[PDB]
Amino acid sequence: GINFQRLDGTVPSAQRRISIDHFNSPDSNDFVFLLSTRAGGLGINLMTADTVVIFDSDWNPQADLQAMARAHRIGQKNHVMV
DNA sequence: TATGCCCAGCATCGTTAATCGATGTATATATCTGACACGTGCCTGGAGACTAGGGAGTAATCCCCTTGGCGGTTAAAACGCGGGGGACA
């Protein structure tokens, strides 16, 4: 029972856009959001988010460094956690 | 003289026994052919023995090619609906 949405490599521009905003709005319930390495770090920014967790290194140095870049941006007012 | 009576006389039927011949069944012998093994004779195409050499084995290095992963469009596969025309009787 935890409210979420997924962020894959398979989604229409219109549908991708709807949720990204739904998420950074002031009063959004879902604190769980799952993303891709190339599809996740693709672009965008997450300003509400503080914690980011890595299952496995992304066969390379730095795909992760941007992967955290989407969440760790100028706005975030809640430190950061990785 | 004709008509019933005595004394032979071969063919009718059936039954017994000996005989020539056909059929069925052994039983040891004399052909028929078809060999497979051996020794006869000879050739050399293989075996046996030795050499020499170059192919192929292996090992050590290289670098090209094949597989992989990924993501964007953009055609293609997929589906269905509908009804016509070919299959099949």
By C-alpha distance, which of A48, A8, A51, A50 is closest to A29? A48
Experimental method: cryo-EM
Measure A55 CA to B31 C1' (Å): 106
Protein contacts on strand B: list nucleotides below 7 Å from a Cβ: 70-72
> Which residues of A in 7-66 have their CB below 7 Å from strand B's atoms?
9, 36-39, 42
CA atoms within 13 A on the CB side of A47: 7
Distance CA(A7)–CA(A36), nearest Å, equals 7
> How many residues comprise chain A?
82
What single-letter amino acid sits at A69? A
The sign of the dihedral angle between the CA atoms of A12, A48, A68, A70 is: positive
